[PDB]
From a paper:
Two moderately broad and potent, clonally related monoclonal antibodies isolated from a single donor, 3BC176 and 3BC315, recognize a glycan-independent epitope that was proposed to be located in the vicinity of the V3 loop and CD4-induced (CD4i) site5. Structural analyses of the 3BC315 and 3BC176 fragment antigen binding (Fab) by X-ray crystallography, and in complexes with BG505 SOSIP.664 by single-particle cryo-electron microscopy (cryo-EM), reveal that the 3BC315 and 3BC176 epitopes are very similar and situated at the interface between two gp41 subunits. To study the paratopes of 3BC315 and 3BC176, their corresponding Fabs were crystallized and their structures were determined to 1.95 and 1.89 Å resolution, respectively. Like many HIV-1 bnAbs, the 3BC315 and 3BC176 Fabs have long CDRH3s, both being 19 residues, in comparison to the average human CDRH3 length of ∼15 residues25.
The complementarity-determining regions (CDRs) of the two Fabs are in very similar conformations with Cα root mean squared deviation of 0.58 Å for the variable regions, suggesting that the two Fabs likely interact with Env in a similar manner. Hence, the 3BC315 Fab: BG505 SOSIP.664293F complex was chosen for cryo-EM structure determination. The 3BC315 Fab crystal structure was then docked into the EM reconstruction to identify elements involved in its interaction with gp41. The majority of possible contacts map to gp41 HR2, with potential interactions between gp120 and the C-terminus of the adjacent gp41 protomer. On the basis of our modelling of this complex, the 3BC315 recognizes Env mainly via hydrophobic interactions and shape complementarity in a quaternary-dependent manner.
Residue numbers in the entry:
A (entry chain L): 3 to 9, 11 to 27, 27A, 27B, 27C, 28 to 95, 95A, 96 to 106, ...
B (entry chain H): 1 to 52, 52A, 53 to 82, 82A, 82B, 82C, 83 to 100, 100A, ...
């Protein structure tokens, strides 16, 4: 409902900023933006509310702001313990609360690494079973988070998508996978399908066709 | 001093119903609403609904209208979340969360629009009543590297093991976590990054074993 980057990162001592884009009906319409910190396997924690305020116990180096339809969370004096997933939230018309998809904050252990992407076509074996799966492989990247967007002849596809949480490779870089379910007719009928991968330092779009 | 204590994890069949409980303490119960927030595995937080504990009035999120019913018992300081007609898509951690201030009806609702205190969450898992073996499909290959792999599609339950070339091939091999699908079945893929120049001369075979269905498949993966 709200849009956040997949990940942000920086060195200890530095600062990061996480954006949270919405519309006039929510972020742009009210000052009811909150942010939550979720440490791996722990309960979410309120860190910002009403765009700029903090609940008690949250240090001053956590700050919030907004401009137009986009809210931002800024964390300075980065510490290892800041490593966590961060979610924004807003009141929205009408009588609802909506949230962003989440942002992984990594306190860099190593320099960043750009992803390599491979997009696999459906196999003839799957096609002859009247089904089709496109598999988008994302390899060798760091920090470990990406956004994957599927397109059909240039236009967005949201149905029939499953995506793995990033996993760690034997060589300690990260990988992810995404799967787009199609009919054989869709596969044969479009000029092309593509997998567009957004990572912290680069974007890659791979295209495949029959 | 505020505490929120939730009931234990639940495992359910599709179509069943479940009622999760959240016990509140450390504040005047009816002065505050209560939220329910969920998190499907590997996914983001989603707002499910709120209840005004003073009186019981409820509002629900868009995708949660109907199959979700939130109640409370003011005599025991307990809030309930009932899910009916469970689907595989309902598999998630369900958190109760208290907002930060009482609402001023017709005047100020700012207090409501945050999740200040959280329960530890209650896992609800909707589990396939089935055993299905996977279909195994080749992921055909083609900086001097190339990727190839196998797609292990539509199986239940876990696990599936995958090796390459009877275990001989290890470098560049990566086997992903399974994705839970809306059907209640899993899929996974295993890939291996290899020299492009090895394509068409080296042989690549994925060895798949899904013991629950006694599915053992060796699939040769050839270039396009």
């Amino acid at each position: 409902a709200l849009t956040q980057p997949a990940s942000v990162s920086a060195s200890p001592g530095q600062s990061i900023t996480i954006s949270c884009s919405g519309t006039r009906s929510d972020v742009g319409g009210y000052d009811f933006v909150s942010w939550y910190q979720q440490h791996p396997g722990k309960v979410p924690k309120l860190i910002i509310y009403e765009v700029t305020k903090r609940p008690s116990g949250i240090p001053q180096r956590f700050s919030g702001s907004k401009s137009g339809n986009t809210a931002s969370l800024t964390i300075s004096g980065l510490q290892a313990d800041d490593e966590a997933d961060y979610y924004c939230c807003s009141y929205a018309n009408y009588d609802k609360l909506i949230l962003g998809g989440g942002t992984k904050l990594t306190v860099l252990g190593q320099p960043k690494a750009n992803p390599t992407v491979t997009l696999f076509p459906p196999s003839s074996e799957e096609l002859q079973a009247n089904k089709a799966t496109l598999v988008c492989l994302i390899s060798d990247f760091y920090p470990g988070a990406v956004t994957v967007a599927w397109k059909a002849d240039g236009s967005p596809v949201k149905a029939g998508v499953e995506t793995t949480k990033p996993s760690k490779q034997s060589n300690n870089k990260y990988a992810a996978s995404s799967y787009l379910s199609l009919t054989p007719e869709q596969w044969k009928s479009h000029r092309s399908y593509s997998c567009q991968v957004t990572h912290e330092g680069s974007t890659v779009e791979k295209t495949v066709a029959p | 001093q505020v505490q929120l204590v939730q009931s234990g994890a639940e495992m359910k069949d599709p179509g069943a119903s479940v009622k999760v409980s959240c016990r509140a303490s450390g504040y005047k119960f009816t002065d505050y609403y209560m939220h329910w927030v969920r998190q499907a595995p590997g996914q983001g937080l989603e707002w499910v609904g709120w209840v005004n504990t003073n009186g019981g009035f409820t509002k629900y999120g868009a995708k949660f209208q109907g199959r979700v019913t939130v109640t409370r018992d003011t005599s025991t300081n307990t809030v309930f979340l009932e899910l009916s007609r469970l689907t595989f898509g309902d598999t998630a951690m369900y958190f109760c969360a208290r907002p930060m201030r009482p609402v001023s009806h017709g005047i100020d609702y700012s207090g409501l629009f945050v999740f200040q205190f959280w329960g530890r969450g209650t896992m609800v898992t909707v589990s396939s009543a089935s055993t299905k073996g996977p279909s195994v499909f080749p992921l055909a290959p083609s900086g001097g590297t190339a990727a190839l792999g196998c797609l292990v599609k539509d199986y239940f339950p876990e696990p599936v093991t995958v090796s390459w070339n009877s275990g001989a091939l290890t470098s560049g091999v990566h086997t992903f976590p399974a994705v839970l699908q809306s059907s209640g079945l899993y899929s996974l893929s295993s890939v291996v990054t290899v020299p492009s120049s090895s394509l068409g001369t080296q042989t690549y075979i994925c060895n798949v074993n899904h013991k629950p269905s006694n599915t053992k498949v060796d699939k040769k993966v050839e270039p396009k």
